[PDB]
Structure 1
Amino acid sequence: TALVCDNGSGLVKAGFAGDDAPRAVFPSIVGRPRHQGVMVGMGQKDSYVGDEAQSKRGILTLKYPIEHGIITNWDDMEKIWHHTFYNELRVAPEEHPTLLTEAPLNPKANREKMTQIMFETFNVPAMYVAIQAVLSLYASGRTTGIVLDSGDGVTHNVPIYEGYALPHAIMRLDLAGRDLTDYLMKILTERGYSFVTTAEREIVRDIKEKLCYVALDFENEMATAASSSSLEKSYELPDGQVITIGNERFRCPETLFQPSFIGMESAGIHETTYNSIMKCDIDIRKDLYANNVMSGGTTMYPGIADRMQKEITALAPSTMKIKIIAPPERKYSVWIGGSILASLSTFQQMWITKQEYDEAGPSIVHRKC
């Protein structure tokens, strides 16, 4: 079969084409010890990749090799791919073609270097690089719609009509889940809790998933929060301490709709989606309005579907119908579409073979993909 690896900014999802769920889902971090070793002959590792780092994170400096959807550390990225191909999938990469994903509007050297590593280090026989937003449309089983893919470093919109993509209407916002974690780390010190280290960033990310939510009306909710203590929630720290947050629950996800909280000048995701639709042709805006697909993990906040529907409804004309498609499996929608695409007879002639790479070099990926 063919591997379908979705190397995101926050998580790595590997598996085999033709399945329905990823086989390996682990954080994309590499940790190194920051203290000195004292015990004798313990076999203490100098680098931890994946779930090993998350279990020993109290004595490590966790670092993401991918930031904002761009691979900045290439020595660390080869370690993560080695962990995926050997310690997680337990396969020989020389026998399976690999399908990779990449966010739109990325540097041309980010995609070229992936081709060089896959073809010269792991010696795969074929490969292909796909766009994450296109793959999210395969999972939903539709050919017309606009995909809002919010992950850990990139929030991009891609409008597709009858299988045709419009590159001029593609947006890309660099506000995503990691920026929400950092913002929540800052608004927590107002209550007294100080989270600083990279290890404690993972703790705050845990608080964000369990408690944070999106309010339908931000102004009304803020008045309710201060009026009574009916919104406070208690979270227990790993060391037994109990912290309480009352209004930081809905202020952190509000950065998506009000990017001025983190000092950004760009508009919210609700306005960015409307802008992308208006850039398309007038005769295709009606179908794009009713087909709003959301993928990625950052689109999993409770109430984000109801909030997004209400905001776009005000901007759009009253005659038009607005529908937001939020499947419960939208976290793994990019991978599922990759498995569907890689399991198609027509796609079998679109792989980049080793022979083509041996004549045109790593620059063939732009012409083919």
Structure 2
Amino acid sequence: ETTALVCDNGSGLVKAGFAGDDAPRAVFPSIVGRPRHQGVMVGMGQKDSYVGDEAQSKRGILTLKYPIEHGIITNWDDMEKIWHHTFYNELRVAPEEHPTLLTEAPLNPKANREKMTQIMFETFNVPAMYVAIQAVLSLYASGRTTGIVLDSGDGVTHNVPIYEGYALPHAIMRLDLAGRDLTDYLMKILTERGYSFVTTAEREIVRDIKEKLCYVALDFENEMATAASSSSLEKSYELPDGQVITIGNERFRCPETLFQPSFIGMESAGIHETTYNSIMKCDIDIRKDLYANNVMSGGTTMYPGIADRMQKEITALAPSTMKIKIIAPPERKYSVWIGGSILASLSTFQQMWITKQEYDEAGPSIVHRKCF
């Protein structure tokens, strides 16, 4: 009992490591694949189930399925399998030796929290654990006490206004739009270009393509016009088979779905509009502080130029009499994990944990009252 482990069950990726380290010791995607063919050879009875980078490597003969969908778990067996894999094969640390820290998106069903707590306390018999929010850990990592969080993850995008020493639970907005919808739209448009991708392996391929050759556009109409003069924007990517794919307008089209959800057919508003509404719902005095500080985190906000576009849109919507500043740290991918590690390292938090004795005597409902 010297340190604690912080695990972030990201909608598309899993981050884990020791409390105190500045970088995670285990970064693998949440994939639980199973064989799709029959199998003929006799010298191998191997691993009916596959997880982790192994699944990514041999994805061509497996039906990859994401255990977590838009922030809510759908298959508990897959999640338990991934937990076991991360705890034993990668970390090689017994659950009893150290406690575990878990994080989840806001406005999630209580059933998921109760089931997760029960499984953690019963199966792995962890000495203690806790449940927190990714946005607050982002604040802790950023070393600030006031601001607005843009936690645009792979599965969920949400904002949580905060003020010095307190939060505003009544001004929390959660949007289902996230990286998965962007990937689906990218596949649909790549079909309109002439390239077809259906199965999950090509889903990973398109995910990589978007990760490598996508960016946001300051002006949509101007970019479309310059695309009409398509002689300096098209770029080529090399597929595993050697085929070359040329991508033009699709580079700056899919990211615009964030600001224009109507493309996918969702009757909602963009991230800028949702943040403006959330800040407006707050008290007048704290609006200045919230404008002066705007923290963003998540893997969906690494597109170059996103900060500039958000700043321009907010300034256009907001009155043109004050200053709006966007802060874009270059390590926002692991901000949640860093915040969790820092929070665990805090001396005052050594008593806020939830132990087996109190959990057993009280019941699973205790976590509900533990910091909401």
TM-score, normalisation: structure 2 = 0.98
Q: State the secondary structure of the residue aligned to 1:284.
A: helix
Q: Is the 1:85–1:92 Cα contact (8 Å) retained in structure 2? A: yes
Shift of 1:132: 0.7
The offset of 1:241, in angstroms, is 0.5
More deviation, 315-324/253-262:
315-324
Displacement of 1:26 in angstroms is 0.1
Check whether the contact 1:11–1:27 (CA below 8 A) recurs between aligned residues: yes
C-alpha contact 1:214 1:303 (8 A) present in aligned 2: yes
Question: How far does residue 256 in structure 1 lie from its aligned partner after superposition?
Answer: 0.5
Note the C-alpha offset of 1:212: 0.7
Q: Within 5 Å, which residues of 2 pair with 1:1-369?
A: 1-369=3-371
What are structure 2's unaligned runs of at least 5 residues? none
Instruction: Output the CA distance in 1 between the equivalents of 2:40 and 2:26.
Output: 34
Q: What secondary structure is seen at the aligned counterpart in 2 of 1:94?
A: coil
- C-alpha displacement of 1:95: 1.5
Does the CA-based 8 Å contact 1:4-1:335 persist in structure 2? yes
Q: Percentage identity across aligned positions? A: 100
SS in structure 1 of the partner of residue 159 of structure 2: strand
> Deviations 1:77-127 (Å, cap 9, x if unpaired)?
000000110011110011111110010001011111110011000100000
CA offset digits 1:168-202 (Å, max 9, x no partner): 11110000111101110000011111000011100
CA distance in 2, matches of 1:242, 1:35: 29
Q: Give the Cα–Cα distance (whole angstroms) in 1 for the partners of residues 227 and 323 of structure 2.
A: 33
Report the Cα distance in structure 2 between the residues aligned to 1:299 and 1:89, rounded to whole angstroms. Answer: 29
In the aligned structure 1, how far is the partner of 2:248 from the partner of 2:164?
46
Deviation at 1:363, TM superposition (A): 1.1
Deviations 1:258-277 (A, max 9, x none): 00111111100011111110
Q: Which region of structure 1 is more displaced relative to structure 2, 225-234 or 338-347?
A: 225-234
Give me the whole-angstrom Cα distance separating, in 2, the residues matched to 1:244 and 1:25: 30
Structure 1 position 38, deviation (Å): 1.2
1:291-320: CA deviations, max 9, x gaps?
Answer: 100100000011111111000000111112
In structure 2, distance between residues paired with 1:230 and 1:85: 48
Aligned residue for 1:149, secondary structure, equals: strand
Once residues 275 and 77 of structure 1 are traced to their aligned partners in structure 2, the CA distance between those partners, rounded to angstroms, is 35
In structure 1, C-alpha distance between the alignment counterparts of 2:337 and 2:306, rounded to whole Å: 22
Q: In 1, Cα distance between the equivalents of 2:229 and 2:43?
A: 59
Q: Distance in 1 between the 2:322 and 2:37 partners?
A: 61
Output the CA distance in 2 between the equivalents of 1:33 and 1:274. Answer: 47
2:367 and 2:190 mapped to 1: Cα distance? Answer: 45
Q: Is the 8 A contact 1:229 1:246 kept in 2?
A: no
Alpha-carbon offset, residue 243 of structure 1: 0.5
Does the aligned pair in 2 maintain the 1:158–1:171 contact within 8 Å? yes
Cα distance between partner residues in 1 of 2:297 and 2:59: 29
For 2:230 and 2:295, the matched residues in 1 are separated by 36
8 Å contact kept, 1:126–1:353: yes
The CA deviation at 1:229 is 2.1
In structure 2, distance between residues paired with 1:136 and 1:204: 28
Shift of 1:41: 2.1
Tell me how far apart the structure 1 counterparts of residues 83 and 205 of structure 2 sit (CA, whole Å): 26
Looking at structure 1, the residues matched to 237 and 229 of structure 2 have their Cα atoms a distance apart, in angstroms, of 22
Question: Alpha carbon RMSD of aligned pairs, Å?
Answer: 0.7
Give the distance between the partners of 2:235 and 2:56, measured in 1 at CA. 25
User: Whole-Å Cα distance in 2 between the matches of residues 320 and 43 of structure 1?
Assistant: 67
TM-score by length of 1: 0.99
Q: Which secondary structure state, in structure 2, belongs to the residue aligned with residue 93 of structure 1?
A: coil
